[PDB]
Amino acid sequence: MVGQLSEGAIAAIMQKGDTNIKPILQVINIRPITSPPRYRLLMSDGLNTLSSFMLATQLNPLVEEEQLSSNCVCQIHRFIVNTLKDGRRVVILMELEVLKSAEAVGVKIGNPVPYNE
Amino acid sequence: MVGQLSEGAIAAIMQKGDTNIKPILQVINIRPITSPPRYRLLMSDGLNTLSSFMLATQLNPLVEEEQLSSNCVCQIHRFIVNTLKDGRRVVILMELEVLKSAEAVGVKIGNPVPYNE
Amino acid sequence: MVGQLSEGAIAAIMQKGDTNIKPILQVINIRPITSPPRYRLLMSDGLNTLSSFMLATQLNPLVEEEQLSSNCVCQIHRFIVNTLKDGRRVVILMELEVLKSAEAVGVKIGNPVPYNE
Amino acid sequence: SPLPSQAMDDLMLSPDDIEQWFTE
Amino acid sequence: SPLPSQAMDDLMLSPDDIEQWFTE
Amino acid sequence: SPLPSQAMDDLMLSPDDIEQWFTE
């Protein structure tokens, strides 16, 4: 099941900041931040979790229609990175495809640990 | 590519002098000042450059082994600030990690301007 | 300080699309899009911000010489509007004068909200 | 919104704006 | 850590994670 | 500027920066 996620993608993005990958990740948690709500995501690549993912607002209908929800597996097709003053890298998801629904997956995959910031 | 650097970190350090950030910066230039040589650095956070960075001497092997070199991107993990009589703030880098090598990055990121002292 | 910006200019341009005004606006952010780079701008008229401003390339030297930069206040002397298939109106700035530098102004003026497209 | 030409608008986000998603 | 932008990270805690502080 | 500790800042000039004084 972990073989279904892009182990090391989070570490790669955090170290290199490159956007030339299309990682498959699991949504662990989604929270709105109140114009359209901004959704923040805690995502997993099976190895690490990271809470600095944000959704571009065009993707809000995926959340609102319950396609993108906790435990679902999705592939990221386009993202950008913005690095804050303090060093945290924020990953803004621009295009993504849900591969497998939350109910199809049904649980957290594996035992990912927070990325060490 | 600028989204890879901690825009505003330099200004933050110069104004607040706080050390509770772990900024990602690009090395622009390194010069030794002649005990171990002391390296002085002109660093960029994408927005500003600043030439009052100094390396703690335990970090000298990173320079000497060519890991830390002009154009590389590094994250600062521990630093201290010392403010001179004249107002300049010197930033002494105690711990850092090279994220991306000079050859991987290959050029100055963006068009940073000197911090206005 | 908001009394220094042309409150309602953005809404006027977006609704009427007329070019017979010479609004005073604040630069909030500038990003190059890679012939000469094309700069895209998020501008404010104090009331609204809008991210569909573009710079004619003859104005690139103002950006490159750091006259036109984030937080500066400028007056637009000539512009054109192009409306995309999807309804967004792009404002291409042809002539402008910087009135007050970024350091003179020093902060975002007021609390402008994104124009509701 | 959402319009196709708004796809990449977050490229233009003020660096302060993003920080504030995390602190406010 | 700790970074200023991590201030509110506990907003993102998996509801199971918090339960486990109390049972494990 | 000018501050006494900035006296020798030109030691740190990017080699490209100096070239550009002569070509631009």
From Swiss-Prot, chains A, B, C:
There is a cross-link at residues 22, 85 (Glycyl lysine isopeptide (Lys-Gly) (interchain with G-Cter in ubiquitin)). Changing residue 40 to E: Loss of HELB-binding. Disulfide bonds: none annotated. It comes from the Eukaryota. Signal peptide: none annotated. The modification N-acetylmethionine is found at residue 1. It is found in: Nucleus; Nucleus, PML body. DNA damage-induced 'Lys-63'-linked polyubiquitination by PRPF19 mediates ATRIP recruitment to the RPA complex at sites of DNA damage and activation of ATR. Ubiquitinated by RFWD3 at stalled replication forks in response to DNA damage: ubiquitination by RFWD3 does not lead to degradation by the proteasome and promotes removal of the RPA complex from stalled replication forks, promoting homologous recombination. Sumoylation promotes recruitment of RAD51 to the DNA damage foci to initiate DNA repair through homologous recombination. Desumoylated by SENP6. Coiled coil: none annotated. It is linked to Pulmonary fibrosis, and/or bone marrow failure syndrome, telomere-related, 6: An autosomal dominant disease associated with shortened telomeres. Pulmonary fibrosis is the most common manifestation. Other manifestations include aplastic anemia due to bone marrow failure, hepatic fibrosis, and increased cancer risk, particularly myelodysplastic syndrome and acute myeloid leukemia. Phenotype, age at onset, and severity are determined by telomere length. Belongs to the replication factor A protein 1 family. As part of the heterotrimeric replication protein A complex (RPA/RP-A), binds and stabilizes single-stranded DNA intermediates that form during DNA replication or upon DNA stress. It prevents their reannealing and in parallel, recruits and activates different proteins and complexes involved in DNA metabolism. Thereby, it plays an essential role both in DNA replication and the cellular response to DNA damage. In the cellular response to DNA damage, the RPA complex controls DNA repair and DNA damage checkpoint activation. Component of the canonical replication protein A complex (RPA), a heterotrimer composed of RPA1, RPA2 and RPA3. Also a component of the aRPA, the alternative replication protein A complex, a trimeric complex similar to the replication protein A complex/RPA but where RPA1 and RPA3 are associated with RPA4 instead of RPA2. The DNA-binding activity may reside exclusively on the RPA1 subunit. Interacts with PRPF19; the PRP19-CDC5L complex is recruited to the sites of DNA repair where it ubiquitinates the replication protein A complex (RPA). Interacts with RIPK1. This is Replication protein A 70 kDa DNA-binding subunit. It comes from Homo sapiens (Human). The chain holds residues 1 to 120 of 616 of the full protein.
UniProtKB/Swiss-Prot annotation, chains D, E, F:
Deacetylation by SIRT2 impairs its ability to induce transcription activation in a AKT-dependent manner. Lactylation by AARS1 prevents ability to undergo liquid-liquid phase separation (LLPS), thereby inhibiting transcription factor activity. Changing residue 12 to I: In a sporadic cancer; somatic mutation. A motif (TADII) lies at residues 16-24. Changing residue 5 to P: In a sporadic cancer; somatic mutation. Changing residue 5 to D: Abolishes phosphorylation by MAPKAPK5. Signal peptide: none annotated. Changing residue 24 to V: In a sporadic cancer; somatic mutation. Changing residue 22 to L: In a sporadic cancer; somatic mutation. It is found in: Cytoplasm; Nucleus; Nucleus, PML body; Endoplasmic reticulum. The modification Phosphoserine is found at residues 1, 5, 14. Coiled coil: none annotated. Ubiquitous. Isoforms are expressed in a wide range of normal tissues but in a tissue-dependent manner. Isoform 2 is expressed in most normal tissues but is not detected in brain, lung, prostate, muscle, fetal brain, spinal cord and fetal liver. Isoform 3 is expressed in most normal tissues but is not detected in lung, spleen, testis, fetal brain, spinal cord and fetal liver. Isoform 7 is expressed in most normal tissues but is not detected in prostate, uterus, skeletal muscle and breast. Isoform 8 is detected only in colon, bone marrow, testis, fetal brain and intestine. Changing residue 5 to T: In a sporadic cancer; somatic mutation. Induction: Up-regulated in response to DNA damage. Isoform 2 is not induced in tumor cells in response to stress. Changing residue 17 to Y: In sporadic cancers; somatic mutation. Changing residue 16 to G: In a sporadic cancer; somatic mutation. It comes from the Eukaryota. Changing residue 2 to L: In a sporadic cancer; somatic mutation. Changing residue 1 to T: In a sporadic cancer; somatic mutation. The modification Phosphothreonine is found at residue 23. Multifunctional transcription factor that induces cell cycle arrest, DNA repair or apoptosis upon binding to its target DNA sequence. Acts as a tumor suppressor in many tumor types; induces growth arrest or apoptosis depending on the physiological circumstances and cell type. Negatively regulates cell division by controlling expression of a set of genes required for this process. One of the activated genes is an inhibitor of cyclin-dependent kinases. Apoptosis induction seems to be mediated either by stimulation of BAX and FAS antigen expression, or by repression of Bcl-2 expression. The N-terminal and C-terminal disordered regions undergo liquid-liquid phase separation (LLPS) following homotetramerization and activation. Post-translational modifications, such as phosphorylation or lactylation affect the ability to undergo LLPS. The nuclear export signal acts as a transcriptional repression domain. The TADI and TADII motifs (residues 17 to 25 and 48 to 56) correspond both to 9aaTAD motifs which are transactivation domains present in a large number of yeast and animal transcription factors. The gene is TP53.
